[PDB]
């Protein structure tokens, strides 16, 4: 049975990501914005039960629990196309509407106040899942609502499902874009803290990389938080297509992630996608070959992680697995490997066996794919530490500067100091160093 994933949408960015994810899943499965399968959606080959629950034989409800400390995001969700996708009883909006004041601690305290409702929502979504593996929380670490509520949701998932894995998709603030959330580094630190203590795996999503991709590839001069969240949801959809369209390979999450996560602590993954195309460029179905795909994957414009230019450490990929969906010629894969070897396009860890795993996945029959072949890469790359190290450095810089702490000082967790943010930054730095260490032979003795 599929490993079902419950999606928790927290704050403005988290709710936007959840809405865009539900839109993409509906489009791929031919589900209307109301949760009803469209008459054209005759291909019952999609796995709704991974991310959606059936309310009836016809109505598909996302297995999503919406928790926010600010009413703005919930109101925007209720005005989105996915308003009818989520179970309204699984949507928690703070009655006070006052938000978290861009304070992670306020959002966390509101999540704690709505803990019972949120965990009831999560359990209701889980009961709609035939073989629920655990919960995946999608949120941003930079805001107040999405950060605090995301940490609260992760905590409550850990409390309710302590024997189940808890993975989070935590969006770290953009370091190249000026965040409107001046307290974003503190919020990011608190979210990394919660991922360290209550999540089992944290996928670091650097908003800087999302903005860079929007600028260079999507031609978006100023990527909004909503646009970054929608890009993240599109990436998650493409990576989860093999979960949603069951096939011969990659029928479970653990099979996909096993090659990417060497140690329980070394759980910081980098992603890659190929071919990369802008949403506007759907028109030209480029006959991209596996060699062309691999060449495009090496372009920084398609990598979902903004690694700093470390001049001292030659950060590298330990291993990369590309799951390619669509028409793929094995001979094209072979030519791609040949060209990569001649060009030395990938460096692997020297201390153990590593390779490019290939998973073949079907495309949604209801969603026209602009690409003959598409692929998600999951990779363990030491450069992912540079995103985590940069987030930690920003957290430490904000705590040391007390920047935007007055908004955080309204919440008890951050009222007197940001010591929790600085300790979180140190823990995230140690995590980054361990991820970088996993590129080295001494990773065998790590820990």
């Amino acid at each position: 049975m599929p490993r079902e994933i419950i999606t928790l949408q927290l704050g403005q960015c988290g709710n936007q990501i959840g809405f865009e994810f539900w839109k993409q899943l509906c489009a791929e499965h031919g589900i209307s914005p109301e949760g009803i399968v469209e008459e054209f959606a005759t291909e019952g080959t999609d796995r709704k039960d991974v991310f959606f629950y059936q309310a009836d034989d016809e109505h598909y409800i996302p297995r999503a629990v919406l928790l926010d400390l600010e009413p703005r995001v919930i109101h925007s969700i209720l005005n989105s196309p996915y308003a009818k996708l989520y179970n309204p009883e699984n949507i928690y909006l703070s009655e006070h509407g006052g938000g978290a004041g861009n304070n992670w601690a306020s959002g966390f305290s509101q999540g704690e106040k709505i803990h019972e409702d949120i965990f009831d929502i999560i359990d209701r979504e889980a009961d709609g899942s035939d073989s629920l593996e655990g919960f995946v929380l999608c949120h941003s670490i930079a805001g107040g609502t999405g950060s605090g509520l995301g940490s609260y949701l992760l905590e409550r998932l850990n409390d309710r499902y302590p024997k189940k894995l808890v993975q989070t998709y935590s969006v770290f603030p953009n370091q190249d874009e000026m965040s409107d959330v001046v307290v974003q580094p503190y919020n990011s630190l608190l979210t990394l803290k919660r991922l360290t203590q209550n999540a089992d795996c944290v996928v670091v999503l650097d908003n800087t990389a999302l903005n860079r991709i929007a600028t260079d590839r999507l031609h978006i001069q100023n990527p909004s938080f909503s646009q970054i969240n929608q890009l993240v949801s599109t990436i998650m959809s493409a990576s989860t297509t093999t979960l949603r369209y069951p096939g011969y390979m990659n029928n479970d999450l653990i099979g996909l992630i096993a090659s990417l996560i060497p140690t329980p602590r070394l759980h910081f993954l980098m992603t890659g996608y190929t071919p990369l195309t802008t949403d506007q460029s759907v028109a030209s179905v480029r006959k991209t070959t596996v060699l062309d795909v691999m060449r495009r994957l090496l372009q920084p414009k398609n990598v979902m992680v903004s690694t700093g230019r470390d001049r001292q450490t030659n950060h590298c990929y330990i291993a990369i697995l590309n799951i390619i969906q669509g028409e793929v010629d094995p001979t094209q894969v072979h030519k791609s490997l040949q060209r990569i070897r001649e060009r030395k396009l990938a460096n692997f860890i020297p201390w153990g066996p590593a390779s490019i795993q290939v998973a073949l996945s079907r495309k949604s029959p209801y969603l026209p794919s602009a690409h003959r072949v598409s692929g998600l890469m999951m990779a363990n790359h030491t450069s992912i530490s540079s995103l985590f190290e940069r987030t930690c450095r920003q957290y430490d810089k904000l705590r040391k500067r007390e920047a935007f702490l007055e908004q955080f000082r309204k919440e008890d967790m951050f009222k007197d100091n940001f010591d929790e943010m600085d300790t979180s930054r140190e823990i995230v730095q140690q995590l980054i160093d361990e991820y970088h260490a996993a590129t080295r032979p001494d990773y065998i003795s790590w820990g």
Partner: protein
């Protein structure tokens, strides 16, 4: 020529040879990913728990596993899935620990009616059953290693064992083994399961007579076995792969046999089998390096050009070339 054309038309429209190939893809090729996942998880749970064939291959247990996999599969309820049957080749007295062939007793049979049984011969159905059994054994081994990894993860989560040097080393060895196994599986799937299947579809579309149809199906199965390393020429290679899988399963059994201990010291949590898991990992690494060297020597010897693809799949990121 008129007879051949009319025979092709009869086989396609009346005998639904294409529909039979589609059924084979749905059921024997595990196109229902949910059914395949449930089957693999149940198989690896039964093998790791040491269930005997009389316990595991009991009709009640096999029927329950099949029913659960079909109910969880989107394609499990399809009439093509209904043509699947889990059969026993032989009844083992005891499930041999860390044996990759533990589940080789299972056979998936496909029934061909007259005249399709002239083209879909009992030899062809036996080859399909063999391929299904091999894919089931490999999925069972992968599922067992995944279950060991999940067990270690859960023990770390319950015991905060993230700092354990032994647990981290065992997890890294498991991850590297799983990466290698998944690369090999992807290579085999692409060549035997994907390329050869496309070739079969083209050949089934080109079959002019019942003997030509039988030839096309035999070619499909032969290509699947050859790309699957199931040929006698690959038997030494296949035997070495089975030995590596057995060592991986033994490492998995050592890791899974005990949960991580609480973190008692600066080295973190200690596993009671940590020394055994480290020795299994070192033996796996040695055997992997020997396999890499052997495959390289064979490719450079020209004897097994498909093994050059196997070496490429193993050493895709050149990880095994640098080691």
């Amino acid at each position: 020529s008129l007879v051949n054309k009319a025979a092709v038309d009869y086989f396609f429209v009346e005998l639904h040879l294409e529909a039979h190939y589609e059924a084979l893809r749905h059921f024997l090729l595990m196109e229902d990913g949910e059914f395949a996942q449930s089957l693999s998880d149940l198989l690896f749970e039964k093998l790791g728990a040491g269930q005997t064939p009389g316990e595991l291959l009991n009709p009640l247990v096999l029927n329950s596993v099949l029913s659960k996999a079909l109910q969880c599969s989107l394609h499990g309820d399809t009439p093509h899935a209904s043509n699947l049957s889990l059969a026993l080749k032989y009844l083992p007295e005891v499930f041999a620990p860390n044996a990759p062939d533990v589940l080789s007793c299972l056979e998936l049979r496909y029934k061909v009616d007259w005249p399709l049984n002239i083209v879909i011969t009992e030899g062809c159905l036996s080859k399909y059953s063999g391929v299904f059994s091999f894919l089931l054994q490999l999925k069972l081994m992968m599922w067992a290693l995944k279950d060991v990894c999940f067990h270690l993860k859960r023990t770390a989560l319950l015991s905060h064992m993230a700092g354990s040097v032994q647990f981290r080393q065992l997890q890294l060895f498991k991850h590297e083994m799983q990466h290698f196994v998944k690369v090999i599986q992807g290579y085999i799937a692409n060549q035997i399961l994907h390329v050869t299947w496309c070739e079969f579809r083209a050949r089934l579309a080109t079959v002019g007579d019942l003997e030509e149809i039988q030839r096309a199906h035999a070619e499909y199965l032969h290509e699947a076995v050859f790309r699957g390393l199931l040929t006698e020429k690959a038997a030494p290679v296949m035997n070495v792969i089975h030995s590596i899988f057995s060592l991986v399963l033994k490492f998995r059994s050592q890791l899974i046999s005990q949960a991580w201990g609480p973190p008692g010291g600066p080295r973190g949590a200690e596993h009671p089998n940590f020394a055994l898991m480290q020795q299994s990992y070192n033996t796996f690494k040695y055997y992997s390096h020997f396999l890499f060297k052997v495959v390289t020597k064979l490719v450079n010897r020209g004897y097994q050009p498909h093994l050059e693809d196997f070496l490429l799949r193993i050493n895709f990121n050149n990880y095994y070339q640098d080691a």
